[PDB]
């Protein structure tokens, strides 16, 4: 059943990304000592991996070899978690503890967390531009790091993280909400699936456009129901947001029917794309690895 | 071939247009990242990095069309880094150059995005930038250059360097490595991003034109202490003594113009320069303080 090869596709690619992102990481006993072991306190150990499971499970569907997705998928990687290190930061989100363990500035120090971020963005470039596993023509690679720096900066993931910060005593419409969540948030998930498709030599524009409003849908989605569960959570026991907007039902349809759209752009595909089908659910649900292992198994 | 000084005009005011084309719009969201982006850019600089750029592609016969992308990508990881060193976690400077710094006419957080974002432009303008009219080979080989003379094994790291080595002394080795790394990296990156748009240039000239921004690149940091020591962390004077440090300028300055063997007047730019950021721009905030 798709779920249960879901949940083997998971850890399997968990750890090969594990792997994939220690070897792309400098040594921790190579000058500059301090800084490499920041960013690998901060990438390495774990984490959902989401970015590179899209970028894995796009990979198997539309027929290309792993091999070929390790570098774009610790690239997406890379720079998620420098976006984390730099937010994390007193001046912006202020998080003194991420995944029951202190934040790179609380377990190094704010100029250590200010350059290991800044390392790891410049080093997902360095992925892109270099690392000789991503065996594709010079146009495609030129075409990743075209992706990934449109969707990292200004008009991205950057951009995004602006208009969070602008709008913290504000009321938004639905398209202003919805615009900041696609910047912040949507473009990276996007890249992810991108990335995938440009290691696939010749691929249909009609397959590229399919995965992306796949990829878009299912970023818009699973942040409503963050909101959703968010505000299930406060209500039940002794920011602009979703179910503020729309109502706790309304922000409920909102999320099933992008929830709706996502399955619906792999009409294009047949069973290879189960593992994406399935894949909407979890990420969208925002279950964990453990709860969807202990229910296929 | 014309003077130093009408290159230096030429050059300042193209950059400033060329950086204007590729930085989003004031009036554009998000309003103020873009604005603070455009304070710190185009606020003023001595666009070190950029004249180094198009006076490389003078002197190996590249046309200035195929440089204002590469000049900008190297001015932006520049300026991004000089924001995040202003930082209070990390040199926490209120004024820069005479104006106030990006995190002091916005604040922090602003601060730590506008570098975030000139960091991923910089990978933008050298992977889409059309006016960059050069094979898909030389492309990928001016972005691979920019994020290892940016990353970890370059500025970034070289930084890291300098913070870990305070409250200490260091060898000749590693100061000049922390040196080569914190800034060289960069420099030597604008000089090779323009031998990149010259397909088919021989390996002997990029590694002439190499030899010269490292040289130089050293020069100006020695000469910057010997500066400071005259007037009143490791450091040449220091380690050397003020002969020893001053020798080392003079053999670095040397080097560099070695490099540049047998070129004719052609090269005057270049050797011209190096004389100019050597002597005058290492002199600088010394000069206005």
């Not at 070897?23 to 500059?32: E, I, S, T, V």
């Not at 202003?176 to 498709?197: P, W």
């Not at 129901?225 to 039940?236: A, F, K, N, V």
């Given at each position: 059943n798709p779920e249960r090869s879901l949940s083997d596709f998971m850890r399997s690619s968990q750890e090969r990304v594990e792997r994939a992102l220690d070897?792309?990481?400098?040594?921790?006993?190579?000058?500059?000592e301090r800084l490499h072991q920041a960013m690998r306190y901060s990438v390495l150990g774990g984490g959902k991996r989401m970015r590179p499971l899209l970028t894995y499970a796009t990979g198997q569907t539309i027929g290309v070899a792993a091999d070929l997705l390790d570098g774009p998928?610790?690239?997406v990687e890379f720079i998620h978690v420098?976006?984390?290190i730099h937010d994390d930061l007193p001046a912006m989100d202020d998080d003194d503890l991420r995944r029951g363990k202190p934040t790179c500035h609380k377990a190094y120090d704010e100029a250590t967390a200010i350059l290991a971020g800044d390392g790891l963005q410049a080093l997902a470039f360095h992925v892109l531009a270099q690392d000789p596993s991503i065996a594709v023509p010079a146009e495609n690679r030129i075409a990743?790091?075209?992706?990934?720096?449109?969707?990292?900066?200004?008009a991205g993931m950057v951009g995004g993280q602006a208009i969070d910060l602008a709008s913290v005593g504000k009321?938004?419409?639905?398209?202003?909400?919805?615009?900041?969540?696609?910047?912040?948030?949507?473009?990276?998930?996007?890249?992810?699936?991108?990335?995938?498709?440009?290691?696939?030599?010749?691929?249909?524009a009609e397959q590229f456009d399919r995965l992306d409003h796949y990829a878009k849908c299912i970023g818009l989605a699973f942040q409503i129901?963050?909101?959703?569960?968010?505000?299930?959570?406060?209500?039940?026991t002794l920011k602009p947001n979703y179910p503020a907007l729309l109502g706790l039902s309304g922000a409920k349809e909102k999320a099933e029917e992008m929830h709706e759209a996502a399955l619906e752009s792999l009409a294009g595909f047949g069973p290879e794309a189960?593992?994406?089908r399935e894949l909407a659910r979890f990420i969208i649900q925002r279950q964990s690895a453990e709860n969807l292992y202990f229910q296929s198994h």
């Open positions: 070897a792309r990481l400098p040594a921790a006993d190579r000058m500059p998928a610790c690239a420098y976006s984390l990743m790091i075209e992706t990934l720096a449109k969707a990292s900066g200004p009321k938004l419409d639905l398209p202003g909400l919805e615009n900041m969540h696609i910047r912040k948030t949507g473009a990276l998930i996007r890249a992810s699936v991108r990335l995938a498709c440009l290691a696939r030599p010749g691929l249909p129901q963050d909101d959703i569960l968010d505000e299930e959570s406060d209500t039940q189960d593992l994406l």
